[PDB]
Amino acid sequence: PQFEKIEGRMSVEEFFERSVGSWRSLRSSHNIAAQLEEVNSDIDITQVAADDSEFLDICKTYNFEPEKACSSIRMSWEGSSDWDENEVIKGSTVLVLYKDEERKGKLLRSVIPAVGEWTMQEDGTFVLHTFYDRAAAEERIWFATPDLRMRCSIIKTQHGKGVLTASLSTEVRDKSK
Amino acid sequence: PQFEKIEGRMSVEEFFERSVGSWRSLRSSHNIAAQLEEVNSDIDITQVAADDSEFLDICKTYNFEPEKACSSIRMSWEGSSDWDENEVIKGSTVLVLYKDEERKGKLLRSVIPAVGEWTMQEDGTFVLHTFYDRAAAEERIWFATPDLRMRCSIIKTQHGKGVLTASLSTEVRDKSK
């Protein structure tokens, strides 16, 4: 079959299901607003059981009933930036997906931030708006192939002077081993 | 008003109309498939008169009636890559836009290649599929602000070994001067 036609009917839960796995990420960022950074990372994306502490605590925090959640994943990563040797960036978060409509809804994450807002575009693109006090982010994520994820993102921050950063990440699924 | 809500109703002809202007571009590319390139460019985007030679010749080549074209622009650029000093990359092309539907159609360009295919996504994103013998490209282009264009693109090439290249360009409109 042809992958592109199949994406345009992908549901958001399928999108998350395909994201499960181990990935090798390359992220290129620049400050618009005049800097250029390269970050190489390993990312593990895993399914989250209905009784998972983190999952229920997020639901609790936002006062959402966990049974109404469509999907939940855990993402853990470790990478390094070429702005700093001898240093590793490690992180972890749980995400929790709710539908307001088939192709629109809210995303909660580990912590308190405003809820994220997402849309699944007609062509299979997952578009996420995320918020912070410091900042706001918009990310577009899609499968270029089953094993290759693209992520193009822009962030407005305000740590001193207001700054826009734009990023492209290419994520390749861990080979058969 | 708020720019984001206004984009989601932008027509493709408005998209092209807003692209007219002078831009400063920063493009980050990598070969998936393991290289990293930075290209800085100036890009001039201009409107194309109905009698423009290039415009009519493209229409002629593809056998489209020029009166049925919705929009046409000329793009000229000059930039340099950090893979090569003492060297400038110069280019020019005319693009010609036809609607098959309000939010879907074909794009012809200067030359013979298959016609390009485009969609205007519900959120204001212009998505273009372009073709070559050597290759195929898919580009997503949108206005992050009125004066800031984002372009996230992927290309499959075959010059010897098959290769995927992913790119992010950030384009800033020439200041008031």
Q: What is the C-alpha to C-alpha distance for residues B130 and B106, in angstroms, rounded to an integer? A: 10
CA-based Rg of chain B, rounded to a whole angstrom?
Answer: 17
CB-based contact A19:A47 (threshold 8 Å):
no
Q: Which residues pair with B161 in a beta bridge?
A: B159
Give, rounded to a whole angstrom, the gap between the first and last alpha carbons of chain A: 26
Burial string for B110-148 (b: 16+ CB within 10 Å, else e) reads beeeebbbbbbbbbbbbbbbbeeeeeebbbbbbbbeeeb
CB-based contact B150:B127 (threshold 8 Å):
no
> Sign of torsion, CA B5 B6 B9 B13?
negative
Q: Cβ atoms within 10 A of the Cβ of A99, count?
A: 18
Residue A49 dihedral angles phi and psi, to the nearest 5°: -70, 155
Residue B36 dihedral angles phi and psi, to the nearest 5°: -135, 110
Which amino acid does the sequence have at B118? W
Q: What is the C-alpha to C-alpha distance for residues B76 and B89, in angstroms, rounded to an integer? A: 11
Q: What is the DSSP string of B40-105?
A: EEEEEEEE--TT-HHHHHHHHHHT--GGG--EEEEEEEEEEETT-TT--EEEEEEEEEEEEETTEE
Closest CA to A23 of A127, A150, A120: A150
Q: How far is B79 from chain A (nearest CA, A)?
A: 17
Cis status, amide bond into B114, omega within 30 of 0: no
CB-based contact A174:A24 (threshold 8 Å):
yes
- Chain B residues in contact with A121 by the CB 8 A cut-off are 121-123, 125
H/E stretch holding B165 reads: strand B161-173
Instruction: Name residues whose C-beta falls within 8 Å of residue A100's C-beta, 6 or more positions apart in sequence.
Output: A106
Which chain A residues touch B if contact means CB-CB below 8 Å? 26, 28, 30, 32, 36, 38, 119, 121-123, 125, 127, 138, 140, 144, 148, 150, 152, 154, 164, 166-168, 170, 172
Please name each of the domains of chain B with its CATH number.
Answer: 1-177 (2.40.128.20)
Closest CA to A20 of A79, A78, A95, A101: A95
Interface test with A, best of B119, B142, B170, B172 (most A CBs within 10 A): B170
Interface test with B, best of A3, A168, A173 (most B CBs within 10 A): A168
> Do the chains contact at B168 and A170, CB–CB below 8 Å?
no
Give, rounded to a whole angstrom, the gap between the first and last alpha carbons of chain B: 26
CA-based Rg of chain A, rounded to a whole angstrom?
Answer: 17
Beta strand ranges found along chain A (DSSP E): 21-31, 36-47, 71-81, 89-101, 104-109, 116-120, 126-131, 135-145, 148-159, 161-173
Q: Which residues pair with A101 in a beta bridge?
A: A104
Closest CA to A77 of A43, A53, A101, A105: A43
- Secondary structure (3-state) at B133: coil
